[PDB]
Design a protein around this ligand. Structure first.
Ligand code: 26M
Ligand code: 26M
Lengths: 807, 807
């Protein structure tokens, strides 16, 4: 049908048809009389997976023969989403499968909706790992993702009476056709026990053992016949009343049972520490085993890079030291040099409550040898600080890996900086904040360690897969090369005055919106107007992300309409979606407020279809692929200095939405790429926030001086949005008035004014679309291929390649 | 190589070779460079499984079109063993796979040793279910086995310092290529809750729900293209702190976690009751759903038979009543008629401590509605007893389903007799004991219910598979037909004086023994003499089975040798094997005594290789397939009246061992088939045991009058077999002397005399072999094809068929 989806040759179609019938018969043990749509999905999945295997085997054989430096990306999260369509895209099989299934009397799109998301992450950090794997394979790097095979991923969110309810994400129920169990590569992981000292050095003895069983999933590059591996570890009890002893095997296997969903506010839970060590200990044994199959650990950093995705796998540092010192018997200083040259650390936040700080008593009991090593690392590090800054005793206390207080804690960020040759933030402003404020002491001691690597997204999933219509009108003008060289989109700047292109860009957006409006009714019985501006904010629910500020705007618009009902306003559909961490009361209250506003707004006859407020239930990778192509306006409105990068912002820019946002995270670089005239920037900059903090933020001042704001607060307090429970929202009002760390009121006026400018532009479709073209055309920087090429050259010491492997 | 293993045609071999390479590549994702022997096993298993699928689909389609009466065999145990070789045998693929693998440079026998036993049973009752499934498929019955998919089967037994140690049988670790998950056929099972009464009748409300997920395994008939199903249920939590709630899903899924290994002494454990209801509730919903796919439950017994394998699934009776009365709204009397006509019950013991008697308080809490129904069944039944036997108030108390006492209990055997149209024992003497003693009252009320169905074994696994050499020398003389018509073995009576046949029978036995002697060294570093008489007792360890009596004989022989070392004796290798239930102290002590005797006997220079005592570790289906073909003498020495049938006895008879045994269980019918002159019968009959009980058994009398017996007891008491712990065996001596329910001393003299007659005959190889021929030739009765034909005609009301389905 469309060019970018590939060829549908007679030979290929015929072959796909027979392999499909073969799998339906031999694999599923069904015939056409009893097969359900799920059986058809599986027959298709196995058919496509068969095309991966030859390339997977030869890629791995290739790395063995050529022995390149290997990249190990350690993450506790891989937010993969669905795999079927992505695999077809990357193997150029999409049109052929479409044709083949069509001939068999099946709708491929319908079969695609059957696949469960692999929801093995919370949000941005987990999805970054997934984009990164795609880019590493597309750039021909010998790269391995290592993580945990959680039995239950991020919870499914249901909304009941306006409230979030959580249910278990039982994503493996029907089986996973993409993974291959490797029970033969099983490895032991140790816990508890005690440390004995001999003449020969230290020994860790009397440990309990959990087995780590690997499951491999193929990661295909974009049309280069490269297929890399993501290896996910699963916990198994070793084989040694009788009944109860058997049932107690559950205790061990609980390590890989469920993903922790609390992506704000760190809590030191023992089971999470076990997960963190488990992935690290099994991964490092695998790495070392592979390195030996090439005595001389001097060459170890020439053949191994380990990237730590935040501090979650930070135990890699003392575990690598443990193995080199206790098992391989290297002297400390040589082991340390190897470790530092091997490890690099990516930081993802600045909120103090988000940093991992493990109580010493937990490590003492669970990992007694690791605690000794961390103490030794700390002593040697602080000796270096003392020599560089003699007499500065407060610096010594600020930089220590060990924090004193009620309970002594280990600061895992400080461990990571001490034991890595490179530390990076995820956007230019974030990396600068790291050097200037939270890791200032570390930067002064070792300035060469600190880098920036601005985040990106893969244009395969986030353009070609989710928005084929847009990908096609672009390919028509500039060819197909841009799909793996996104900087080529700049060529589109010469079409900004092209009448045909303007019309096509606008037509694709209209089609995406009609499709999404239809999805909403069929699957959720909700009525929307497709001619309205689609105003969307989708991301995890956090105070810093300021869903609340968006709420205030929605109510302002509603109040204005009620005040002057016969005045024309640009119609809007305001959609907000995102999950709240189960323990986060304020985030759960924000969800309830959103639905409560909807209840009032959506049923007010005076409003009509001029304003609609919808809460997008169960936001996840598959839903983002649907809503992002349909968006006109992207809400990126975190308080300046709080969102380290953002990546959802990039997805929207690539797909033809305009952005309203603060100068925060990657928004700054996006505005710089597109030109500030083509971006809706508002609000305090980081400097303005600092000045407010120096003086003291008083929310009352805003309430006193802004009549429209005072009206919203009275409506909330008095029960306008909760008639049967008038004080339902008192916690929200109280926080806004007295303890708002994120200064919601301070940006309110500028935000409302800026939103008026959005509505003005949307009235002029031709000029709206021309601004959209200038955004799409300057989105090239934010390809994760650019990000990974910078990691490879500036951190890993390896050269990317665009060359094909033989097919 | 050998005729009965089938054809190896050029077309077949070539096709098997390519499908093997296809599975190795696409299924396992390996090539020849990294493949382990386990990968080769799996490639072969998937290749053979592919041959089943077409026949499996068409068999099930056939039953749908023809709508025959369906047989549902409900068992908590299916002791299946390995599947690969059995599937090849039944599909006539054995020689072809052998050739194909040989050409690929592989040894098929070696690949066969890689497969885990499906050890989903304890011993005889579980293995009977497995033989029965094979016979039902071979006889063309529309039959379904229904059970539980245990994650952990019968424990692996290790012997450490002479003691049994139990380890988890993690049989699913590497995956099971034979099963197909059917997540779409998942069904809810209810527990706990309470009973509400309306106008409409009773309602069971506020229940907790566990899901039952089915896994189907194909059951191939012998060369008839019939493939039936064994459906095994697995427990899954329904989908509705957060972390802990996720981890608590284990509680629900524990129902199908582990097989209970205590096959003597019933213990009322709540988790076992849940297992019993779980299999019954899910199975009956499946049965009813299938019946509806044909209002009129009158025809239900014309289209459904349910066979209960002991009382373990006895809850089928009140569950069927519950469904018909509460859900389908049938009146009680009509529902009851349907139930009785549908259900039949097979009894497997006479030991009072083995009968299931569930405490009422357990049923009250777990299954409140079932307890009401059982009470109602009991009231109506006892009303019938009172009318038939007016004034006999003690009969009323003896026959009640409810037993009074400390705790009130339900007698599940009484429930089963009341709610079944047929009750059978498993050997002629057992069925007679049922009518005359333990169920006498029930027989007097309803004599037409009571039947005999003498047990059998499948000659496919138990001759063709495990002893191809013997199968071949038989096929040479009489053709291949006997494999599915075992009565044809009688034709062998005309070869009893045939010199060539005598030599061939003896040669096959010698080859089996050389092979087994070699297996022992290679896998267990133990040295045996292959010219000795192989004296074997393999079966679960129980006092009633009298491994202890065998122990006394072994010590007698040892004492005799020590007494007269230069006198010739027929050399023996005495092998004893079997698992003890984890809670059974005396059985664990018997295992230790056996190894302790071995320690002394096997290292005494005076003995030489004239006597060896070996404990066969980890006895299970795969080991029985090795040791049974190698045996000369089969020990079947239970106290008269205690072994309901035995089936191991039949396996030995079919494979060329002679039998030393009591007139107990099926031994009686075996001796009757072969002629008593061709059997080594000794000891008390049931009548002699009764007379002893009337007078009172005094073990001291035997000890006083038998000097050789007194010597053994002093050796045991004084520490001759346990030098470092002189009183190790005091419990054994104490039991023998003071509380032996199984009268070990009373049979001792006759047993020793009889064993002398065995040794005399073995000295004359020609006459030994002629007696063997007369045993093999009269073993036809004990084919499970005969047993199943009698069940089908006399209980299920269906006609077996030997006709092929189209291929
Ligand atoms: O997604 C995250 C953080 O997610 C988690 C996920 C899990 C945890 C966690 C930590 C300890 C224990 C349990 C859970 C903490 C944070 N951060 C985002 O990372 C993106 C990629 O760099 C950035 O674009 C976002 O700005 C940043 O908020
Ligand atoms: O194997 C058995 C009994 O096995 C079990 C297995 C499990 C249980 C059980 C019962 C309740 C709770 C837990 C376990 C009780 C008995 N009996 C044998 O059945 C054979 C087949 O009919 C006969 O040949 C044997 O004589 C008989 O002992």
């Amino acid at each position: 049908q469309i060019s970018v989806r590939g060829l549908a040759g007679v030979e290929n179609v015929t072959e796909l048809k027979k392999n499909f019938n073969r799998h339906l018969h031999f694999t599923l043990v069904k015939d056409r009389n009893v097969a359900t749509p799920r059986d058809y999905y599986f027959a298709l999945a196995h058919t496509v997976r068969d095309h991966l295997v030859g390339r997977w085997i030869r890629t791995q054989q290739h790395y063995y023969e050529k022995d390149p430096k290997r990249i190990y990306y350690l993450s506790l999260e891989f937010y993969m989403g669905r795999t079927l369509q992505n695999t077809m895209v990357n193997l150029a099989l999409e049109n052929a499968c479409d044709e083949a299934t069509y001939q068999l009397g099946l709708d491929m799109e319908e079969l695609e909706e059957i696949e469960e998301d692999a929801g093995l992450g919370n949000g941005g950090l987990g999805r970054l790992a997934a984009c990164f794997l795609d880019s590493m394979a597309t750039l021909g790097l010998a790269a391995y993702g290592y993580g945990i095979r959680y039995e239950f991923g991020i919870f499914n969110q249901k909304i009941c009476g306006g409230w979030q309810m959580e249910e278990a994400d039982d994503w493996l129920r029907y089986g996973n056709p993409w993974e291959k169990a490797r029970p033969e590569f099983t490895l032991p992981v140790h816990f508890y026990g005690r440390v004995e000292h001999t003449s020969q050095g230290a020994k860790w003895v009397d440990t309990q053992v959990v087995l780590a069983m690997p499951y491999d999933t193929p990661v295909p590059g974009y049309r280069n016949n490269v297929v890399n591996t993501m290896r996910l570890w699963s916990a198994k009890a070793p084989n040694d009343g009788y009944i109860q002893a058997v049932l107690d095997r559950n205790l061990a296997e609980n390590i890989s049972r469920v993903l922790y969903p609390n992506d704000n506010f760190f809590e030191g839970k023992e089971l999470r520490l076990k997960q963190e060590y488990f992935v690290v200990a099994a991964t490092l044994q695998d790495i070392i085993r592979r390195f030996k199959s090439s005595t001389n650990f001097d060459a170890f950093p020439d053949k191994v890079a380990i990237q730590l995705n935040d501090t979650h796998p930070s135990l890699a540092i003392p575990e690598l030291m443990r193995v080199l010192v206790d098992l391989e018997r290297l002297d400390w200083d040589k082991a340390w040099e190897v470790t530092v040259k091997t490890c690099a650390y990516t930081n993802h936040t600045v909120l103090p409550e988000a940093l991992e700080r493990w109580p010493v008593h937990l490590l003492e009991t669970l990992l007694p040898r690791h605690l000794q090593i961390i103490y030794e690392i700390n002593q040697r590090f602080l000796n270096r600080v003392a020599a560089a800054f003699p007499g500065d005793v407060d610096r010594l206390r600020r930089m220590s890996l060990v924090e004193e207080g009620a309970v002594k804690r280990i600061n895992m960020a400080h461990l990571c900086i001490a034991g890595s040759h490179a530390v990076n933030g995820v956007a230019r402003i974030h990396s600068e904040i790291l050097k200037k404020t939270i890791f200032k002491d570390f930067y002064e001691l070792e300035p060469h360690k600190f880098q920036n690597k601005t985040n990106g997204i893969t244009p395969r999933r986030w353009l070609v897969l989710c928005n084929p219509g847009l990908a096609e009108i672009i390919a028509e003008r500039i060819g197909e090369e841009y799909i793996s060289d996104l900087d080529q989109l700049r060529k589109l700047l010469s079409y900004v005055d092209d009448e045909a292109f303007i019309r096509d860009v606008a037509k694709v957006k209209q089609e995406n919106k009609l499709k999404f409006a239809a999805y909403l009714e069929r699957e959720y019985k909700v009525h929307i107007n497709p001619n309205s501006l689609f105003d969307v904010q989708v991301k995890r629910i956090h105070e810093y992300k300021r869903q609340l500020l968006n709420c205030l705007h929605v109510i302002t618009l509603y109040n204005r309409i009620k005040k002057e009902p016969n005045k024309f306003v640009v119609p809007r559909t305001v959609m907000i979606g995102g999950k709240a961490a189960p323990g986060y009361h304020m985030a759960k209250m924000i969800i309830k407020l959103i639905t409560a506003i909807g209840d009032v707004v959506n049923h007010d006859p005076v409003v009509g279809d001029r304003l609609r407020v919808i809460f997008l239930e169960n936001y996840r990778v598959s839903l983002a692929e649907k809503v992002i192509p349909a968006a006109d306006l992207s809400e990126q409105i975190s308080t300046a200095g709080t969102e380290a990068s953002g990546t959802g912002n990039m997805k929207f820019m690539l797909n033809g939405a305009l952005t309203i946002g603060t100068m925060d995270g990657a928004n700054v670089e996006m505005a710089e790429e597109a030109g500030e005239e083509n971006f809706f920037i508002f609000g305090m900059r980081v400097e303005d926030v600092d000045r407010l903090d120096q003086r003291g933020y008083n929310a009352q001042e805003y309430y006193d001086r802004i009549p429209e704001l005072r009206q919203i607060i009275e409506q909330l307090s008095s029960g306008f949005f909760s008639p049967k429970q008038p004080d339902l929202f008192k916690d929200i009002v109280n926080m806004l008035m007295h303890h708002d760390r994120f200064k919601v009121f301070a940006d309110y006026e500028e935000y409302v004014k800026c939103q008026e400018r959005v509505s003005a532009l949307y009235k002029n479709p031709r000029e709206w679309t021309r601004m959209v073209i200038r955004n799409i055309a300057t989105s090239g920087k934010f390809s994760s291929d650019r990000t990974i090429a910078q990691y490879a050259r500036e951190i890993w010491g390896v050269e990317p390649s665009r060359q094909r492997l033989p097919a």
